[PDB]
């Protein structure tokens, strides 16, 4: 997240750590969000390779012990039937997780609430991005979480010819663009958590940005819209 803030501890208790293996240890990759206690919402890019990948809940900082972690390893990965991933333009831009365990909840460790099927928001809904992406373009992962307020652009401006063009689909959600603040890479497959009937949902699974940088004006973080996928999780959840 570029032009972030770090988050409070326990503001964002879904918010998860995607991390794969390297060497003898771990290293971020992307986001996600705990939906169940056994299922992690990510971004269906964020698992294109074929790495072990584990879940981390209940972390804050990628470099300290916070005390508050629970480690589980990734047991199924169910891609979006209609993901490629040589057209994230396309979307689908999502996959399930199923956790070898069942996570712990606590205070930093909760579901995250999606929306209702269906719901758009109002351009310029008040909406968080967390992660813990790049802070700056072509920078470094943060160590600790980090939140910037992102509102939403409606389809009808991303998709403008300014913004995204026919990039953006209506099954995203854009948010940002303001050229200082946007998610950026490691944030990834995590959350817009955006304030709806004063409940934070989550309304985006952080997707892309513009190959120009993160915080690019006008090419606000493009998410896939959680809204266009509750059958298709719904259905995953049921059936594994
Ligand atoms: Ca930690
Ligand atoms: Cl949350």
């Known amino acids: ?3 972030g803030t770090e988050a409070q501890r326990n503001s964002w208790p879904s918010q998860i750590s995607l991390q794969y293996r390297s060497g003898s240890s771990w290293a971020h990759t992307c986001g996600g969000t705990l939906i169940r206690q056994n299922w992690v919402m990510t971004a ?3 698992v294109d390779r074929e790495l072990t990948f584990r879940v981390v809940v209940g972390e804050h900082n990628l470099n300290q012990n916070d ?3 629970q480690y589980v390893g990734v047991q199924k990965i169910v891609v979006h039937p209609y993901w490629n991933t040589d057209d994230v333009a396309a979307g ?3 996959a399930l997780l199923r956790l070898a365990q069942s996570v712990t909840l606590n205070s930093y460790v909760q579901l995250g609430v999606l929306p209702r099927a269906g719901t758009i928001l109002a351009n310029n809904s008040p909406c968080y991005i967390t992660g813990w992406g790049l802070t700056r373009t072509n920078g470094q992962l943060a160590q600790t979480l980090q939140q910037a307020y992102l509102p939403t652009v409606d389809y009808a401006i991303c998709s403008s010819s300014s913004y995204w063009g026919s990039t953006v689909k209506n099954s995203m959600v854009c948010a940002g663009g303001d050229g200082v603040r946007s998610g950026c890479q490691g944030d990834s497959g995590g959350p817009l958590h955006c304030l ?3 409940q934070y949902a989550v309304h985006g699974v952080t997707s892309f940005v513009s190959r120009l ?6 090419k606000p973080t493009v998410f896939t819209r959680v809204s266009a996928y509750i059958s298709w999780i719904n259905n995953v959840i049921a059936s594994n």
Do not use: K
Request: net charge negative.
């Open 67 to 69: 005390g508050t972690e």
């Open 196 to 198: 709806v009937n004063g």
């Open 1 to 3: 997240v570029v032009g």
């Open 44 to 46: 269906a890019h964020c």
């Open 92 to 94: 689908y831009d999502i």
């Open 213 to 218: 940088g993160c915080n690019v004006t006008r």
